[PDB]
Ligand binder design. Structure first.
Ligand code: HEM
Ligand code: HEM
Ligand SMILES: Cc1cc(N)nc(CCc2cc(F)cc(CC[C@@H]3C[C@H](F)CN3C)c2)c1
Ligand SMILES: Cc1cc(N)nc(CCc2cc(F)cc(CC[C@@H]3C[C@H](F)CN3C)c2)c1
Ligand SMILES: C[C@H](O)[C@H](O)[C@H]1CNc2nc(N)[nH]c(=O)c2N1
Ligand SMILES: C[C@H](O)[C@H](O)[C@H]1CNc2nc(N)[nH]c(=O)c2N1
Ligand SMILES: [Zn+2]
Lengths: 407, 411
């Protein structure tokens, strides 16, 4: 019950005890493992707050102090009267850093403690949300020297006054279904690109059209805002060996900024909490460009390479996939925009695991998501056993707003 | 209670009811998932329910559930257990059980072929020489001059655990590995410990980089004995590359027949501790793992050197570049010598068809995503985007401890 994880490339064995702190459920049972499934009142609130505050005052080596019990009583009092409570700034920063730290699917967690936390709990309107988000984008982009950041909008009250960012990421390319057949732009964003136009957006109907922001303050109807183009750093995609690569007309944005998740701290639900870091190269080159349900450019790259596309066993998809991902890294590095290759990021994560087992006793990790989508077994995480369990504070998925919002 | 899995590339959703017939445990709990963990003595008490459960399955599949043949076989198995503490499978039951052990192997991407297994009954075998003969015949049959055929050979079942039949090799055909005094390894680093046992048991090692290991065979619980597989039975493919003429000068070769020999087959509560089985290779087993794992032949360096890649920073993806060429070479060499092989795109697409068929005619298909997804180019194969439910059905193939750790030595 004090479990161990073996690395099969190095025979290193770590002993996990943090998992016994786990609270939420995995979706698995003793009879079935769901490890590859994408998505599985006053009374409940105070224990949630007590648990959070308890781990908070332990982190500052003040467990069982006057300040501890005072804050416990203080929050206890506020919950009994107000039926919720407000986090101290110090608790808010800690809660957010640990939500990232606890994100078992995230390979970039070695950087968890350097997060820049922007308190936007004083926000009241979508224009205000826009302003906070513009400031976030500029701070995080930092002229290509990217910096991690989260901006936290007011917490849920009764579920009728929810703050929500309707975009899945702050920066995303539009996608338009075609009269003849398939999709122009990004197919993953077709419904959202629809709802923007269907809410008022004027689409330039290109391939790499930056979507507008669709912001919902206090449960009101959402509003469209265009992010100033000078704040959207983009990288033209070229190849260091293939001069015809520019001709493909590819580019990507520099800032990955997830905006549709829910941040849970001490029982409190922050439904609008956009956070950003920097890209791992394969997120763009393997998934964004080469997924069949996305930009799906493999055929054309292989064609331009004059590879034998007659049989799958010539490995022409594999050959193109590598070249595409070399170009993405070359392009970002050339333009001095932060990016990490999957070899560096997974090595970093092994070192982060070793740190967490050492200074914390564990590290929840989701192998299905930590292993990169290309060249999996030549990366050290492939041979690393990992235990997956849910700690809190946490980032959680939430329903898409348009399915919910009393419009 | 029904369960759904979604393919996120195609939005195809499937409904699993077969997980209801799940008996064994996964290792997971509601509070921890052990999905990435590699590998996480039976009395008459619990044996008849395990037999009854198996025989119910067997007669259901031949559409004879509740027949007189079914009830008489239950009763005959009953008395045989209480009188002898074990029981013997009929030939039909052995074939059914072993095919279904393969069918239930949740980590096996090649299961579309499960119904075509050739089953060799070796339950009359009694000595290590008899085992060697059966194994030679298996290799000849399965190799079929390069037109590989799946097969399994089944030696006598466990009795009191003190008389096990075991094949001490992890695979019937494997290359030796030799630890040098300077710290380096010659041959296959994965086989250094087994190679040392063989040398201790009297094997004269040629000490090359591709020495076929001898068979080390244990019958009825006696000390194991050494036999050399006749070289003309061991089909090997020199590896060359279709564009790189220098690739042949690396001196690489691999054997054609993948044949796992250290697993336990469980049917109706009976334990078959020696059940070597064989199929054909997916190219990545050789080109990604066998050659490019840091803990195997690890040729990425020299291939990248001969390709004159930018090897300084990892962000040039020279490692990913060399891996693809090596895997082109393995596929080209096998197809050119007409030795059966399947690429990882074909195999995973076939498996998706298999799985959808299993959901439709069987109510599910237990699948271990961590093992099904190929070790290169994961997300450009259809299994990456496929949700999968993992659970344990019997008959099954199980891991067992290495025999040199448990065996009581006669001398
Ligand atoms: C700074 C560099 C970062 C890198 C390289 C990185 C990388 C990744 C990758 C590759 C994934 C896999 C998901 C996918 O493939 O779409 C992921 C998931 C995730 N990341 Fe990180 N990330 C970074 C920063 C952050 C930050 C700053 C946060 C939060 C403050 C965060 C939170 C998460 C969460 C919650 C998930 C899981 C989503 C889920 O459960 O499905 N990441 N990350
Ligand atoms: C016919 C072509 C076959 C192919 C291409 C194939 C391929 C594979 C692959 C790639 C794996 C993953 C394990 C690894 O990478 O080391 C695997 C596992 C497995 N295969 Fe298949 N296989 C084939 C035939 C068979 C046969 C004939 C059997 C048994 C009769 C079998 C039983 C298994 C089992 C039990 C596992 C699970 C290993 C474990 O639990 O660790 N396979 N196979
Ligand atoms: C901050 C950051 C840094 C970085 N390097 N990368 C990212 C993007 C990774 C990601 C994180 C997340 F918290 C949720 C999603 C949504 C995943 C989507 C949603 C759907 F369910 C299937 N996935 C395609 C994606 C973010
Ligand atoms: C029949 C067949 C066809 C095919 N195409 N391939 C294989 C080999 C794959 C494999 C299958 C198996 F049933 C057990 C193992 C044992 C796993 C060992 C242990 C360690 F993890 C490294 N593996 C080599 C490996 C077999
Ligand atoms: C830690 C991890 O479970 C281990 O490295 C597994 C992962 N998936 C695998 N998948 C296959 N096909 N073969 C393997 O050896 C492994 N190794
Ligand atoms: C079905 C499967 O769970 C799904 O395709 C997952 C697999 N692993 C993943 N891993 C990462 N990093 N990102 C993903 O979107 C997915 N998708
Ligand atoms: Zn699980």
């Amino acid at each position: 019950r004090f479990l161990k994880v073996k690395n099969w490339e190095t025979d290193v064995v770590l002993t996990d005890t943090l998992h016994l702190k786990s609270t939420l459920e995995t979706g698995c049972t003793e009879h079935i493992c769901m490890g590859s499934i994408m998505l599985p009142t006053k009374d409940q609130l105070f224990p949630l707050a007590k648990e959070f505050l308890d781990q908070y005052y332990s982190s500052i080596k003040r467990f069982g102090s006057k300040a501890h019990m005072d804050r416990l009583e203080e929050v206890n009092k506020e919950i009994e009267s107000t039926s919720t409570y407000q986090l101290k700034d110090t608790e808010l920063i800690y809660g957010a850093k640990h939500a990232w730290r606890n994100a078992s699917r995230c390979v970039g967690r070695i950087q968890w403690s350097k997060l820049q936390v922007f308190d936007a709990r004083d926000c009241t309107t979508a224009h205000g949300m826009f302003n906070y988000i513009c400031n976030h984008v500029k701070y995080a982009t930092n002229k290509g020297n990217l910096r991690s950041a989260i901006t936290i909008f007011p917490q849920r009250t009764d579920g009728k006054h929810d703050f929500r960012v309707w975009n899945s990421q702050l920066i995303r390319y539009a996608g338009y279904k075609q009269p003849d057949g398939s999709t122009l732009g990004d197919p993953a964003n077709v419904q959202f690109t629809e709802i923007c136009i269907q809410q008022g957006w004027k689409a330039p109907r290109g391939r790499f059209d930056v979507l507008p922001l669709l912001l919902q303050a206090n449960g009101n109807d959402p509003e469209l805002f265009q992010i100033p183009p000078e704040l959207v750093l983009e990288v033209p995609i070229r190849h260091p060996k293939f001069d015809w690569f520019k001709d493909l007309g590819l580019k990507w944005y520099g800032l990955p900024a997830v905006s549709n998740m829910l941040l849970e701290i001490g029982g409190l639900e922050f439904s609008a909490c956009p956070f950003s870091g920097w890209y791992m190269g394969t997120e763009i080159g393997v998934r964004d460009y080469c997924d069949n349900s996305r930009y799906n450019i493999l055929e054309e790259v292989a064609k331009k390479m004059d590879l034998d596309m007659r049989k799958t066993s010539s490995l022409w998809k594999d050959q193109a996939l590598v070249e595409i991902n070399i170009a993405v890294l070359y392009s970002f590095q050339s333009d001095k925009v932060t990016i990490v290759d999957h070899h560096s990021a997974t090595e970093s994560f092994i070192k982060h695991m070793e740190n967490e087992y050492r200074c914390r006793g564990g590290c929840p990790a989701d192998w299905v998501w930590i292993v990169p989508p290309m060249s999996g077994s030549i990366t050290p995480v492939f041979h690393q056993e990992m235990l997956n369990y849910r700690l809190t504070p946490s980032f959680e998925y939430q329903p898409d707003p348009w399915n919910t919002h009393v419009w």
